[PDB]
Swiss-Prot record:
Monomer. Lysozyme C is capable of both hydrolysis and transglycosylation; it also shows a slight esterase activity. It acts rapidly on both peptide-substituted and unsubstituted peptidoglycan, and slowly on chitin oligosaccharides. It catalyses: Hydrolysis of (1->4)-beta-linkages between N-acetylmuramic acid and N-acetyl-D-glucosamine residues in a peptidoglycan and between N-acetyl-D-glucosamine residues in chitodextrins. The keyword Zinc does not apply. The gene is LYZ. This is Lysozyme C. Belongs to the glycosyl hydrolase 22 family. One of its GO terms (cellular component) is tertiary granule lumen.
Length: 130
């Protein structure tokens, strides 16, 4: 379910990620819509780990969720990968939160520096879905 750019910002704020751990709605919108495009079902196979990711932020089942086939699945969220497979990112966004809860944050991907590098993104969440 890929909606407009100011549509997921309303779902993210209602969840609680707004101003969470320093990652504002625009910080995740700048990378989530770029790595998938507001598509929680954006799943693809991995030629290096042979695993599969599920969620709008490419959440993998190797170190974030336990699916049943990923070897060494530590599942930090402790939830099934079906939560990130649905557009209802209630528990899905909660699993991706653990990815930015570490000391790295949302800068784990190189696209973060090539997209906005945490610049003035307050316009994407200025009266969008608060």
């Amino acid at each position: 379910k890929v909606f407009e750019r100011c549509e997921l910002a309303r779902t993210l704020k209602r969840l609680g990620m707004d101003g969470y751990r320093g990652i504002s709605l625009a910080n995740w919108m700048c990378l989530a819509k770029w790595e998938s495009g507001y598509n929680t079902r954006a799943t693809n196979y991995n030629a290096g780990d042979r695993s599969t990711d599920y969620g709008i932020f490419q959440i993998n089942s190797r170190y974030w969720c336990n699916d049943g086939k990923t070897p060494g699945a530590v599942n930090a969220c402790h939830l099934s990968c079906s939560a990130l497979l649905q557009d209802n990112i209630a528990d899905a966004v909660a699993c991706a939160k653990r990815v930015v809860r570490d000391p790295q944050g949302i800068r784990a991907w190189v696209a973060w520096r090539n997209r906005c590098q945490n610049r003035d993104v307050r316009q994407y969440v200025q009266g969008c879905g608060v």
